[PDB]
Amino acid sequence: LPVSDADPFALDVLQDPLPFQANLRDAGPVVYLRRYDVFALGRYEQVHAALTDWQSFQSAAGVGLSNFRYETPWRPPSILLEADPPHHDAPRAVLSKILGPRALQKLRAAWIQDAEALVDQLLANTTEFDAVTDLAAAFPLRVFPDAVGIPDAGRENLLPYGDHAFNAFGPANGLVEKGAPRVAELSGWVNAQCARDALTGDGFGAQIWAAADRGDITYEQAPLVVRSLLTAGVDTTVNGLAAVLYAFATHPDQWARLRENRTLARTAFDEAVRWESPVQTFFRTATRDTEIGGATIPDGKKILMFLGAANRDPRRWENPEVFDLGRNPSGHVGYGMGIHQCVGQHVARLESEALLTALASRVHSLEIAGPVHRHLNNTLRSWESVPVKVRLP
Numbered sequence: 001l002p003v004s005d006a007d008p009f010a011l012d013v014l015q016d017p018l019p020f021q022a023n024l025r026d027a028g029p030v031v032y033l034r035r036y037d038v039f040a041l042g043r044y045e046q047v048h049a050a051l052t053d054w055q056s057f058q059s060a061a062g063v064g065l066s067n068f069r070y071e072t073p074w075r076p077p078s079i080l081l082e083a084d085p086p087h088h089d090a091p092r093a094v095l096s097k098i099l100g101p102r103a104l105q106k107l108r109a110a111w112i113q114d115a116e117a118l119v120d121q122l123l124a125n126t127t128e129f130d131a132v133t134d135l136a137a138a139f140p141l142r143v144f145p146d147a148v149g150i151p152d153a154g155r156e157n158l159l160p161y162g163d164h165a166f167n168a169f170g171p172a173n174g175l176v177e178k179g180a181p182r183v184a185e186l187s188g189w190v191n192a193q194c195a196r197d198a199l200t201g202d203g204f205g206a207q208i209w210a211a212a213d214r215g216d217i218t219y220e221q222a223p224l225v226v227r228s229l230l231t232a233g234v235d236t237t238v239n240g241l242a243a244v245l246y247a248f249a250t251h252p253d254q255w256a257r258l259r260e261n262r263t264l265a266r267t268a269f270d271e272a273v274r275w276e277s278p279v280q281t282f283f284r285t286a287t288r289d290t291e292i293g294g295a296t297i298p299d300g301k302k303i304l305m306f307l308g309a310a311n312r313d314p315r316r317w318e319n320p321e322v323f324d325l326g327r328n329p330s331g332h333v334g335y336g337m338g339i340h341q342c343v344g345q346h347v348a349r350l351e352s353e354a355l356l357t358a359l360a361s362r363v364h365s366l367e368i369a370g371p372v373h374r375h376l377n378n379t380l381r382s383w384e385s386v387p388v389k390v391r392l393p
């Protein structure tokens with residue numbers, strides 16, 4: 001069995017994980033990380049197998065490093081992300097209906113419009129700006145908390161709350177331990193936005209509580225289902241949006257292709273999600289001795305699935321390092337796969353469709369205007385700054 005002292009949460013790897021990914025894939029289907037006592041998977045075949053096989057690889061012992069068999073969770077674990085069937089089934093089906101295609105139809109014209117207002121206002125002021133702060137961060141914060149229906153107070157908690165959650169899936173290293181004094185306040189705030197009386201009458205929050213009225217979920221589940229939205233719903237889309245913007249800023253032919261066919265927006269965003277893989281890793285825990293990639297994972301031990309690695313595995317993807325909207329990215333594991341696969345993907349895509357359409361409407365060409373800067377995180381590939389210069393027609 002290949003065994004390694006590689007630390008996937010070291011600051012150098014988080015800054016640039018592409019060499020670790022390629023070594024993981026090259027070493028074997030399964031690599032034992034001695035540092036953490038887990039089994040790493042980097043190739044698509046095994047990452048796909050592990051994601052779908054919920055019977056062998058459970059989530060309820062936690063999908064971070066931390067094993068809830070023994071360790072105290074930093075918060076009450078997610079009743080979606082960290083629940084197996086049957087407990088998973090009810091809250092899943094509620095979000096699945098609420099965030100599904102049909103349901104989102106009603107928000108499309110609003111979100112297109114908000115995107116056009118954000119872009120018009122930005123462009124009236126500057127032709128050069130940061131795509132992170134001015135676009136990728138700014139647009140989800142305009143539309144998404146409003147669609148959930150939380151109030152305006154404490155909205156500055158959304159990004160740190162998400163950040164901390166994604167960090168907290170990794171080891172108790174400095175990125176988690178620096179977050180840990182501010183947890184109580186961060187948690188205090190989020191719980192407070194999940195109550196029925198904190199939410200507007202019509203948003204996703206409202207609809208979650210309406211599902212509880214019908215007995216789809218309990219009144220005890222209702223706030224934690226809202227909480228999933230406020231953990232997973234913001235940071236991921238910001239980083240997905242910074243990735244596709246960075247890609248278009250770096251790929252003038254691909255930008256022209258979008259401008260020729262605006263219906264390419266959905267597939268543009270999915271290709272960014274494959275190529276960037278905003279969520280890089282998750283854990284599962286083996287329920288039995290299970291054989292994957294030629295290796296036996298003992299009952300009770302954790303696997304580490306490298307989504308980013310699988311999404312650039314050349315066994316599944318031709319020339320994987322390339323961002324190409326010509327590629328069919330369908331089958332990427334950037335949203336996961338099987339019963340836990342991202343229930344917010346219709347939201348992500350509509351966001352990208354709105355923003356991309358607004359941008360392409362006004363912007364002849366786009367380039368990188370300055371150094372790019374990452375924001376380090378144990379689990380989430382985060383962008384801090386993407387300076388861009390746009391040329392108006």
Ligand code: HEM
Pocket residue numbers: 051059063080081082092099228229232233234236237240273277278279282333334335336337339340341342343344345347348
């Ligand atoms: C680009 C954006 C996004 C990425 C890259 C992403 C990624 C993921 C991945 C990889 C999973 C699978 C978890 C696992 O298998 O253990 C997932 C699940 C989930 N995502 Fe997303 N996500 C994104 C956007 C969103 C949005 C906008 C929401 C808001 C609705 C959301 C809510 C969730 C929830 C609740 C789950 C857990 C579902 C379950 O366990 O059944 N995500 N996401």
Ligand SMILES: COc1ccc(C(=O)O)cc1
Pocket residue numbers: 078079080081165227228229231232279
């Ligand atoms: C993909 O990341 C997440 C993170 C948190 C949750 C949750 O809190 O429900 C779901 C998905």
